[PDB]
Amino acid sequence: GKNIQVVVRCRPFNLAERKASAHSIVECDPVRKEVSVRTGADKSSRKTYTFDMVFGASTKQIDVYRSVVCPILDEVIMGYNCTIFAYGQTGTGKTFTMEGERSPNEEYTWEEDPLAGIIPRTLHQIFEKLTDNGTEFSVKVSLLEIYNEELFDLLNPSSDVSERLQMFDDPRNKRGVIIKGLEEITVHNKDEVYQILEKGAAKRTTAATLMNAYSSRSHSVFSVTIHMKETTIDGEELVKIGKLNLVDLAGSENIGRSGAVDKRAREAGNINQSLLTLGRVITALVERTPHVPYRESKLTRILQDSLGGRTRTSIIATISPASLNLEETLSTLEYAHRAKNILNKPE
Numbered sequence: 558g559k560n561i562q563v564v565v566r567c568r569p570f571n572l573a574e575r576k577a578s579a580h581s582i583v584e585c586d587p588v589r590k591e592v593s594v595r596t597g598a599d600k601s602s603r604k605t606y607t608f609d610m611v612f613g614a615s616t617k618q619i620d621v622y623r624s625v626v627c628p629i630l631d632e633v634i635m636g637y638n639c640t641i642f643a644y645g646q647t648g649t650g651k652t653f654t655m656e657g658e659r660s661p662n663e664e665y666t667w668e669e670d671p672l673a674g675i676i677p678r679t680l681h682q683i684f685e686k687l688t689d690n691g692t693e694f695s696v697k698v699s700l701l702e703i704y705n706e707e708l709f710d711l712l713n714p715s716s717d718v719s720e721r722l723q724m725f726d727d728p729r730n731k732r733g734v735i736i737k738g739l740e741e742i743t744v745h746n747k748d749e750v751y752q753i754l755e756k757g758a759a760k761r762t763t764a765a766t767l768m769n770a771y772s773s774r775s776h777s778v779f780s781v782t783i784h785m786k787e788t789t790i791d792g793e794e795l796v797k798i799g800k801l802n803l804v805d806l807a808g809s810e811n812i813g814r815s816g817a818v819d820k821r822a823r824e825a826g827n828i829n830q831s832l833l834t835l836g837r838v839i840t841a842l843v844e845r846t847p848h849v850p851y852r853e854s855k856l857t858r859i860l861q862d863s864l865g866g867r868t869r870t871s872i873i874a875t876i877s878p879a880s881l882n883l884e885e886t887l888s889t890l891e892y893a894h895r896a897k898n899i900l901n902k903p904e
């Protein structure tokens with residue numbers, strides 16, 4: 558029940574906002590666990606939302622990682638597949654958290670830097686934690702980009718100038734999907750990752766257009782796979798496998814409020830499907846429904862094994878308080894509410 562979780566993150570509106578003239582009545586409160594926004598004459602109305610964990614504008618980037626990650630890794634560290642994703646409108650800090658951030662000016666080491674997102678924060682933990690554990694481990698890192706009816710591998714530009722790749726299901730496992738030439742190179746050195754990592758930004762960064770939706774319209778999935786072998790004085794050798802998936806998603810503004818002027822139509826479309834496929838797939842899992850349409854979305858199909866195998870999943874929604882975008886906040890809220898169902902606390 559508990560393992561599936563929903564997190565919504567709220568921060569103070571950007572300083573640059575004034576030119577827009579956007580007004581933010583939006584609020585985020587952790588202690589209450591509920592976020593309410595004034596509907597605004599008829600402005601007394603305030604939206605009531607309930608989540609187990611709700612990030613605030615004050616809240617540190619580190620605090621979120623410990624809350625949702627610092628917990629998943631141990632299960633994942635044990636050798637259980639887990640998925641952490643950020644969905645919602647665009648530029649809500651998902652990439653900064655997901656791809657991390659670097660403090661302005663000359664700065665402490667990246668692990669040292671406060672700014673960095675889950676991947677940098679998530680990545681920093683694995684090497685250090687293992688050292689304390691002392692178990693032998695091998696690291697494989699892979700990155701993916703989602704374009705409709707197309708798949709790309711960030712790590713290697715080799716063998717391809719820049720072409721879409723087909724995906725193949727595997728007979729040995731009915732659930733399993735196999736992609737040829739998929740590039741995951743296990744990390745020889747943890748320090749080494751940045752040089753290897755540096756390529757991912759450049760290749761994705763250069764090709765974003767036509768495209769034209771890159772970052773904003775592309776989920777972009779980065780996955781880390783761990784192989785662990787630990788000994789024992791009583792031991793003996795024990796083998797465990799850990800897979801962690803970290804991803805970024807398109808903006809949540811498109812999704813309809815329930816019984817919205819537009820819900821299916823607003824959320825409707827081929828581009829729409831990955832988000833829509835996720836809600837039914839994600840929504841179905843919470844319910845326990847016999848049939849889950851993981852198949853409909855390519856991203857969903859790949860994710861099935863981690864979800865399908867015993868796993869823990871955390872679902873994240875990001876919002877902006879400012880008046881200037883009406884659509885993004887509602888779509889995130891409907892998606893979060895729809896995806897996760899919780900009774901609303903009444904104060």
Ligand SMILES: Cc1ccc(C(=O)N(CCCN)[C@@H](c2oc3cc(Cl)ccc3c(=O)c2Cc2ccccc2)C(C)C)cc1
Pocket residue numbers: 652653655656657658659660667668670671672673674676677678680751754755756757758759760779
């Ligand atoms: C503390 C911190 C956090 C994020 C960044 C950052 O902005 N990155 C670029 C992507 C957009 N935020 C990071 C980053 O860059 C990548 C570049 C390529 Cl080509 C492929 C993958 C990455 C990637 O996963 C990250 C995430 C990251 C990891 C550790 C520290 C910081 C960020 C740093 C390695 C600079 C820098 C420092």
Ligand SMILES: Nc1ncnc2c1ncn2[C@@H]1O[C@H](COP(=O)(O)OP(=O)(O)O)[C@@H](O)[C@H]1O
Pocket residue numbers: 568646647648649650651652653658772773
């Ligand atoms: N809490 C925050 N405080 C200050 N700036 C933030 C915060 N969250 C996000 N940002 C800013 O927003 C930008 C990141 O948005 P981005 O990573 O492009 O998201 P997306 O890829 O979803 O568009 C960065 O310039 C970062 O400085």
Ligand SMILES: [Cl-]
Pocket residue numbers: 567568583584585614878
């Ligand atoms: Cl807020």
Ligand SMILES: [Cl-]
Pocket residue numbers: 566567583584585586592593876
């Ligand atoms: Cl809020």
Ligand SMILES: [Cl-]
Pocket residue numbers: 623627628
């Ligand atoms: Cl912890």
Ligand SMILES: [Cl-]
Pocket residue numbers: 627631
């Ligand atoms: Cl722990």
Ligand SMILES: [Cl-]
Pocket residue numbers: 726
């Ligand atoms: Cl198939």
